[PDB]
Scaffold this active site. Structure first.
Site, PDB file in Angstrom:
ATOM      1  CB  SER A   1      -0.940  -0.080   1.215  1.00 57.69           C
ATOM      2  OG  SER A   1      -2.002   0.838   1.104  1.00 57.69           O
TER       3      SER A   1
ATOM      4  CG  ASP B   1      -6.118  -3.110  -4.169  1.00 59.27           C
ATOM      5  OD1 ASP B   1      -6.610  -2.007  -3.825  1.00 59.27           O
ATOM      6  OD2 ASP B   1      -5.058  -3.537  -3.671  1.00 59.27           O
TER       7      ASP B   1
ATOM      8  CG  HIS C   1      -5.846  -2.115  -0.337  1.00 61.09           C
ATOM      9  ND1 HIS C   1      -4.825  -1.984  -1.253  1.00 61.09           N
ATOM     10  CD2 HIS C   1      -5.482  -1.390   0.742  1.00 61.09           C
ATOM     11  CE1 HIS C   1      -3.883  -1.202  -0.747  1.00 61.09           C
ATOM     12  NE2 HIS C   1      -4.257  -0.830   0.463  1.00 61.09           N
TER      13      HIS C   1
END
Length: 197
Positions: free
Chosen positions: A104, A159, A172
Site C-alpha cells: 500500500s 483493488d 486491498h
C-alpha cells in the site's frame, strides 16, 4: 512479531548475506505490519536466521493514511527514512545482496525510495515485491529506474488503488496468501539467481 530492526541492531563484523528492507501499509503496527512477518519467516527458512536480516521502515515513517494523497504517494520524511536504511545497509554490509518490499503506502514509499537511490546501491537490490501498489497505474506497473525483471507487483482484481484510485475496498486487504507464498518465492529465486548456492 511486527517489529524487526535486524540491520540497525546487527554487528557489522558478522553481516548477513541477505538484507530485506520492508515498508508497511497505512495504520499498520510496528515496522512490518500485517504482511511483513509472513515474508520474514519464509526468508529465514531459506537462508537461515543468521543468513538474512529483516529490517522494517520505522523512524519517521508513521504510515499516515492521508499521506497517500501527497505527490509521491507518501511523505518526504518517509522517503528520507527508507533511503537512509538502504544507505546504512550499503555501508554496514557492502557485500550483502539486498531485497525490498512494500504494501500500500509502503509500496509507493519503496518505489519512490528506489527511484531516488544512487544507482550503485539500487543495483544491489536483486528483487522487489509490491502489494496493493498505489502508483501501479501511474507508473505502468514499474518502479522508475529499476528493471522489470527484478520487480513483482501483486495487484488484486477489484483493488481500486491499483487502478488509480485511493479508495480502500475489500481486495486491498486480501494479500495474505501472496505474502505467504509467491512473494517470498520470488525474492528467494532472485537472490539465488545472483548469489548461486
Amino acid at each position: 512479531r511486527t517489529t524487526r530492526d535486524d540491520l540497525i541492531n546487527g554487528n557489522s563484523a558478522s553481516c548477513r548475506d541477505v538484507i530485506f528492507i520492508y515498508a508497511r501499509g497505512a495504520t499498520e503496527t510496528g515496522n512490518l505490519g500485517t504482511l511483513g512477518p509472513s515474508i520474514a519467516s519464509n526468508l529465514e527458512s531459506a537462508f537461515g536466521k543468521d543468513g538474512v536480516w529483516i529490517q522494517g521502515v520505522g523512524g519517521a515513517y508513521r504510515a499516515t493514511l492521508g499521506d497517500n494523497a501527497l505527490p509521491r504517494g507518501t511523505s518526504s520524511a518517509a522517503i528520507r527514512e527508507m533511503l537512509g536504511l538502504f544507505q546504512q545497509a550499503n555501508t554496514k554490509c557492502p557485500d550483502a545482496t539486498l531485497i525490498a518490499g512494500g504494501y500500500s503506502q509502503g509500496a509507493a514509499l519503496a518505489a519512490a525510495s528506489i527511484e531516488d537511490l544512487d544507482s550503485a546501491i539500487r543495483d544491489k537490490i536483486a528483487g522487489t515485491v509490491l502489494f496493493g501498489y498505489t502508483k501501479n497505474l501511474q507508473n505502468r506497473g514499474r518502479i522508475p529506474n529499476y528493471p522489470a525483471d527484478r520487480t513483482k507487483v501483486f495487484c488484486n482484481t477489484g483493488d481500486l488503488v491499483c487502478t488509480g484510485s485511493l479508495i480502500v475496498a475489500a481486495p486491498h486487504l486480501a494479500y495474505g496468501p501472496d505474502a505467504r507464498g509467491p512473494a517470498p518465492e520470488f525474492l528467494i529465486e532472485k537472490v539465488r539467481a545472483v548469489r548461486g548456492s
